[PDB]
Design an enzyme around this catalytic site. Structure first.
Site, PDB file in Angstrom:
ATOM      1  N   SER B  14      30.772  33.714  27.472  1.00 48.10           N
ATOM      2  CA  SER B  14      31.767  33.090  27.221  1.00 48.10           C
ATOM      3  C   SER B  14      32.137  33.297  25.517  1.00 48.10           C
ATOM      4  O   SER B  14      32.977  32.764  24.644  1.00 48.10           O
ATOM      5  CB  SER B  14      32.354  31.602  27.360  1.00 48.10           C
ATOM      6  OG  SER B  14      30.541  30.807  27.327  1.00 48.10           O
ATOM      7  N   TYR B 163       9.199  26.763  24.091  1.00 51.14           N
ATOM      8  CA  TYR B 163       9.881  27.886  24.056  1.00 51.14           C
ATOM      9  C   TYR B 163       9.713  29.023  23.519  1.00 51.14           C
ATOM     10  O   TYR B 163      10.030  29.798  24.371  1.00 51.14           O
ATOM     11  CB  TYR B 163      10.748  27.420  22.565  1.00 51.14           C
ATOM     12  CG  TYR B 163      11.800  28.140  21.913  1.00 51.14           C
ATOM     13  CD1 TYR B 163      12.952  28.901  22.867  1.00 51.14           C
ATOM     14  CD2 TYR B 163      11.474  28.482  20.968  1.00 51.14           C
ATOM     15  CE1 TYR B 163      13.652  29.622  23.095  1.00 51.14           C
ATOM     16  CE2 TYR B 163      12.397  30.199  20.840  1.00 51.14           C
ATOM     17  CZ  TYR B 163      13.580  30.272  21.036  1.00 51.14           C
ATOM     18  OH  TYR B 163      14.491  31.676  20.624  1.00 51.14           O
TER      19      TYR B 163
END
Ligand SMILES: [Ca+2]
Lengths: 267, 272
Positions: B14, B163
């Site tokens: 998107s 992470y």
């Protein structure tokens, strides 16, 4: 002899198998052992509970605490750590033992199975470390010992069963990162892995009994923690260094060629 | 070397890098399935599956907007099924994903840890699993995961374990997938930028100005160069944008800078 007398161990998945063996070896010394595992209600299909384990700890010479703890649930981990601290006054040692295994390829690994492995193995080690560390950091000789192999980028190993290799190497890589972060703060954050398959198409006669890992764990956990981190150790080598050189007694059937463990190169 | 008529399934497209890749492929006449969570716009982080699909159409391709949270296996399966029903197959999967948290372990809540593992490593695995039956039937199948070369560098692991686990997990999934399926002629590789790329995610990088980054189009153009290669015999590679572009005869990268007056910031997870 070196001893875990007076020390408090928090061991995940220790209702049975290697976790229970490690619990009992520590108990023999008079250790406090918090058995943090999902199995509370006795099931004949998979014998052993936190309660049978705690009783075995007591009978072996230690102080057992049975804690219902599905380590997939952060709140249960946190509650179990607080219970341990409330009962025993602190936590000296975390053993990340809980593990789920599935050796199929990617198209043959349902996401339920993939998720079980990631959550119990790498994530379980991370959340238990996270919850224990504040207490470990206050102990005189803190250890985190994760039952995981040396980290490897071996493509054959990864391709063989990507879901399991991700989850198990995840434990190794969480150990690697935790050791880099907290090792310099005095915490002995290391891994221990068996040379052979451990009996807990795979034939138990070609395996070793879980006591080899219990005895190897003991040898690691009694070490000075200061300056000892980021190591990926193997049971046979640990035991040799400790003066246990005759390993024949650990064999299920000493006439059989032993099955090599996953995730170790053969020389 | 064109993506005309090829069908790409791109997660998180998107906006940002995924969108840029989507539009570069569209320019060739590719079909692009935009699999992302945002269906309606907000002031903070513009772009939706519908604006991205419309942009693909405007650019010369065929866009398909798919409401798909890649944390949800059922939505991924639904999106893949729709893509096959719309275009006849899947030629290319692009594992594009953004969940970053650069803090130490005591400062990494489990909700954040979980978001990262679910969107990054798990998302790549579940999308690969869902697309593979279709990729294995395509003429020139690729899986391209946007992830760094795998590394056991302890400093990188210690800096932000949650992470690093999540993003290296995407690399390690790629490593395994390539070893398993690469031999069947699927081009399963990774691509990573030399520099930081300007996207909304630089908000999660303290101090990082978009001006010291490259534009997402460098990753779009490097992706195109990878995806138009022959798939047979091309798997298990951890590629870098600048190197891919150099092999393709594009050695002047100056136009990819957001702002030429600034020195470019080196990307995470690459040795200098
Ligand atoms: Ca296998």
């Amino acid at each position: 002899s070196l001893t875990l007398s007076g020390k408090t161990l928090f061991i995940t998945g220790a209702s049975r198998g290697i976790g229970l063996a490690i619990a009992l070896r520590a108990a023999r010394d008079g250790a406090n052992v918090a058995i943090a595992a999902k199995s509370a209600v006795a099931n004949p299909k998979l014998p052993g509970t936190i309660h049978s384990a705690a009783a075995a700890v007591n009978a072996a010479g230690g102080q057992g605490l049975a804690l219902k703890c599905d380590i997939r649930e952060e709140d249960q981990v946190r509650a179990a750590v607080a219970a341990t601290v409330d009962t025993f006054g602190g936590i000296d040692i975390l053993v990340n033992n809980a593990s789920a295994i599935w050796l199929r390829g990617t198209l043959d690994t349902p996401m339920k199975r993939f998720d079980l492995m990631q959550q119990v193995n790498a994530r379980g080690s991370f959340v238990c470390a996270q919850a224990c560390l504040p207490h470990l950091l206050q102990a005189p000789n803190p250890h985190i010992l994760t039952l995981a192999p040396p980290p490897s980028l071996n493509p054959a190993w990864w391709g063989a069963h990507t879901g399991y290799t991700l989850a198990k190497m995840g434990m190794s890589l969480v150990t690697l990162g935790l050791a880099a972060e907290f090792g310099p703060q005095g915490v002995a954050i290391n891994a221990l892995w068996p040379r052979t398959v451990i009996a807990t198409g795979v034939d138990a006669a070609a395996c070793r009994r879980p006591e080899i890992m219990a005895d190897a764990a003991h040898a690691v956990l009694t070490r000075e923690a200061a300056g000892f981190h980021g190591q990926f150790l193997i049971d046979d080598e640990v035991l040799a260094q400790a003066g246990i050189t005759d390993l024949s007694g650990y064999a299920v059937d000493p006439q059989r060629a032993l099955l090599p463990d996953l995730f170790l190169e053969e020389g």
